[PDB]
Amino acid sequence: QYSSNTQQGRTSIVHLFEWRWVDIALECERYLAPKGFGGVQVSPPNENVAIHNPFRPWWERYQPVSYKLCTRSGNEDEFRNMVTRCNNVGVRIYVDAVINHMCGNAVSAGTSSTCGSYFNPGSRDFPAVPYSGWDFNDGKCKTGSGDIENYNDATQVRDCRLSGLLDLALGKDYVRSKIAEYMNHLIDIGVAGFRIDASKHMWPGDIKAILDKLHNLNSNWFPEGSKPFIYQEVIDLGGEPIKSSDYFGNGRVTEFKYGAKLGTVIRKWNGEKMSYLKNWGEGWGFMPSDRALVFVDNHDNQRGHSILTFWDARLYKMAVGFMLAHPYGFTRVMSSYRWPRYFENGKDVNDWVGPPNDNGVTKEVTINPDTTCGNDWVCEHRWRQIRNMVNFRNVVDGQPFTNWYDNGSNQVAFGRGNRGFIVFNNDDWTFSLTLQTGLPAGTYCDVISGDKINGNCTGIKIYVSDDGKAHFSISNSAEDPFIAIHAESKL
Numbered sequence: 001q002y003s004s005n006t007q008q009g010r011t012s013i014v015h016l017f018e019w020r021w022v023d024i025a026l027e028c029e030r031y032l033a034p035k036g037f038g039g040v041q042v043s044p045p046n047e048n049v050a051i052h053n054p055f056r057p058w059w060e061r062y063q064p065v066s067y068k069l070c071t072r073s074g075n076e077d078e079f080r081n082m083v084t085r086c087n088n089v090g091v092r093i094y095v096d097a098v099i100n101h102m103c104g105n106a107v108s109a110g111t112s113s114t115c116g117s118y119f120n121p122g123s124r125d126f127p128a129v130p131y132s133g134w135d136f137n138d139g140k141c142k143t144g145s146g147d148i149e150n151y152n153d154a155t156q157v158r159d160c161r162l163s164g165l166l167d168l169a170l171g172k173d174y175v176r177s178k179i180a181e182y183m184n185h186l187i188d189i190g191v192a193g194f195r196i197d198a199s200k201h202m203w204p205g206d207i208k209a210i211l212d213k214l215h216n217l218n219s220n221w222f223p224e225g226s227k228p229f230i231y232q233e234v235i236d237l238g239g240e241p242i243k244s245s246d247y248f249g250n251g252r253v254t255e256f257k258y259g260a261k262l263g264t265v266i267r268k269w270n271g272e273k274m275s276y277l278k279n280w281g282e283g284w285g286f287m288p289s290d291r292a293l294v295f296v297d298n299h300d301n302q303r304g305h306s307i308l309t310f311w312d313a314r315l316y317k318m319a320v321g322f323m324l325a326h327p328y329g330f331t332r333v334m335s336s337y338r339w340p341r342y343f344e345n346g347k348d349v350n351d352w353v354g355p356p357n358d359n360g361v362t363k364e365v366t367i368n369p370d371t372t373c374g375n376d377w378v379c380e381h382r383w384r385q386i387r388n389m390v391n392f393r394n395v396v397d398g399q400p401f402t403n404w405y406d407n408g409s410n411q412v413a414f415g416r417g418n419r420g421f422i423v424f425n426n427d428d429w430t431f432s433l434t435l436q437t438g439l440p441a442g443t444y445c446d447v448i449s450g451d452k453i454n455g456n457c458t459g460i461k462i463y464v465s466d467d468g469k470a471h472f473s474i475s476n477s478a479e480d481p482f483i484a485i486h487a488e489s490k491l
């Protein structure tokens with residue numbers, strides 16, 4: 001469960017949040033394959049509640065109605081088509097598995113669902129599965145409300161309703177088997193693994209029991225005996241009885257400390273500075289690198305405070321670039337849509353807004369002439385600075401963190417063996433200095449400011465001399481105050 005199952009030399013997943021299956025299929029072929037992306041995390045592919053108040057929120061997809069592969073992203077045919085076309089060009093699909101719960105307990109009965117399935121929350125009736133009253137934790141939960149009230153009580157965190165979401169009885173072999181049936185359907189289609197939603201709200205032993213029932217990966221694309229990559233969503237910043245480490249038996253775990261601390265550093269908040277990143281990773285009290293799934297922001301926390309997002313583009317690019325250059329963890333890049341933010345007493349009252357849509361119909365991802373996206377899709381994964389850093393990570397794969405420099409403040413650099421070097425200026429004055437890069441002598445294209453195309457650079461050029469040294473100059477007023485060069489950006 002710890003191996004991503006990506007093609008050799010492909011080291012990142014991108015979350016194509018709320019993207020339609022047809023758009024993902026095309027993206028694999030036209031972009032992700034040739035740009036060396038490892039895979040795609042997809043929104044939940046299973047039927048959910050169509051919520052009309054407010055209007056089709058992104059979070060409706062986290063309220064299951066059945067395991068029918070029928071959503072605003074598309075149907076089962078489209079989903080199969082996407083996985084096949086993606087695997088055929090060496091790009092993997094990872095499913096957002098919502099298996100802790102069904103929908104909100106107070107949702108109205110009926111067929112207000114993305115595949116028209118009937119369901120009745122009040123009577124605990126989900127006949128498209130089927131689930132019935134016996135398949136939920138109503139009787140196991142010991143809180144007065146039936147919901148989670150206190151995170152300092154590990155038992156209710158697992159046995160009670162997360163914000164009133166009906167809590168599946170994962171201790172029952174029947175419930176485990178219905179979930180495994182769904183996950184096995186996806187595996188056989190060709191899915192390479194799973195993001196396990198709300199992992200904290202499940203007993204590690206119940207997750208294990210479900211995983212024990214899973215097939216090996218599809219033997220047309222994957223070597224014999226391949227297991228799904230598992231990365232479990234557990235938010236653990238400390239201070240709670242449940243720990244990320246409790247889930248290590250099942251696979252990797254999201255390291256939420258990662259983006260929280262890096263954002264704080266890059267914003268220069270709380271007295272933090274980039275020079276402190278010299279011992280980044282386990283030195284910052286993070287989980288072991290071989291279990292961490294890392295990211296600057298995710299679909300939840302990009303809607304809250306302190307986290308860096310595409311809204312803070314300049315600092316965001318640096319943070320994502322630092323992450324992609326650094327060997328700690330397995331990296332996931334966010335890909336978002338814009339929504340009509342509106343702040344009222346410091347809260348975004350429109351943080352619920354679903355993907356770009358015309359009366360609830362998801363808009364296609366259009367591609368502009370300059371390779372950016374239209375229709376309000378942000379496409380961070382297509383931003384030159386990020387896309388090129390995704391390749392940087394591939395090129396330097398397996399090389400050691402080395403040649404660290406800092407000015408004691410916010411001017412830092414480091415290399416990856418003899419294959420890549422990166423330089424950051426986050427201070428309020430100019431970074432002008434000759435540094436040991438660890439690289440062979442040559443002219444290198446800065447892949448942040450530009451591209452190598454045939455035999456020239458479209459941006460900055462760095463000149464590495466015979467002793468591996470090169471001069472860097474980065475103004476503090478630079479639009480992208482960082483430079484990165486690697487073995488494949490050499491002229």
Ligand SMILES: C[C@H]1O[C@H](O[C@H]2[C@H](O)[C@@H](O)[C@@H](O[C@H]3[C@H](O)[C@@H](O)[C@H](O)O[C@@H]3CO)O[C@@H]2CO)[C@H](O)[C@@H](O)[C@@H]1N[C@H]1C=C(CO)[C@@H](O[C@H]2O[C@H](CO)[C@@H](O[C@H]3O[C@H](C)[C@@H](N[C@H]4C=C(CO)[C@@H](O)[C@H](O)[C@H]4O)[C@H](O)[C@H]3O)[C@H](O)[C@H]2O)[C@H](O)[C@H]1O
Pocket residue numbers: 059060061062063098104105106147151162163164165197198199200201233235236237240300301
């Ligand atoms: C979203 C996230 O929530 C949980 O995370 C906890 C975390 O475990 C805690 O440690 C802690 O963390 C804080 C920490 O304390 C801070 O100090 C630190 O700085 O920041 C962190 C936060 O980053 O708090 C957080 C937040 O509570 C889960 O542990 C985690 O798994 C969650 N992420 C997941 C899971 C889900 C669930 O599938 C997805 O959730 C999203 O979708 C749901 C469902 O649609 C949506 O909720 C909506 O629907 C509800 C039914 C509704 N409820 C109301 C109705 C009631 C009547 O029945 C009431 O009973 C109830 O109380 C009402 O609130 C919600 O209002 C409505 O919004 C979620 O909002 C949405 O996020 C995530 O996307 C997925 O990634």
Ligand SMILES: C[C@H]1O[C@H](O[C@H]2[C@H](O)[C@@H](O)[C@@H](O[C@H]3[C@H](O)[C@@H](O)[C@H](O)O[C@@H]3CO)O[C@@H]2CO)[C@H](O)[C@@H](O)[C@@H]1N[C@H]1C=C(CO)[C@@H](O)[C@H](O)[C@H]1O
Pocket residue numbers: 238261271272273276279283284285
């Ligand atoms: C282990 C520790 O890691 C992180 O701490 C960072 C600091 O946030 C950062 O400012 C910097 O701290 C000093 C640095 O170590 C030192 O070399 C430099 O000269 O001065 C810096 C402060 O001015 O670097 C450290 C990591 O080296 C996290 O932010 C911390 O939360 C984290 N602490 C841990 C460890 C313990 C055990 O004592 C608990 O207190 C806490 O629960 C846990 O999170």
Ligand SMILES: C[C@H]1O[C@H](O[C@H]2[C@H](O)[C@@H](O)[C@@H](O[C@H]3[C@H](O)[C@@H](O)[C@H](O)O[C@@H]3CO)O[C@@H]2CO)[C@H](O)[C@@H](O)[C@@H]1N[C@H]1C=C(CO)[C@@H](O)[C@H](O)[C@H]1O
Pocket residue numbers: 313314369370371372373378382383384385451
């Ligand atoms: C492909 C493209 O990537 C990069 O562009 C990013 C910005 O760097 C990023 O900050 C963000 O810009 C938004 C900005 O923050 C805000 O002021 C404004 O309201 O909205 C902007 C988006 O419209 O997003 C864009 C991408 O959408 C580079 O900075 C661009 O130079 C880069 N274009 C290049 C690169 C290539 C090939 O690598 C060519 O295809 C393209 O023609 C060329 O212009």
Ligand SMILES: [Ca+2]
Pocket residue numbers: 100157158159160167168201202
């Ligand atoms: Ca639960």
Ligand SMILES: [Cl-]
Pocket residue numbers: 195233254298
């Ligand atoms: Cl996540």
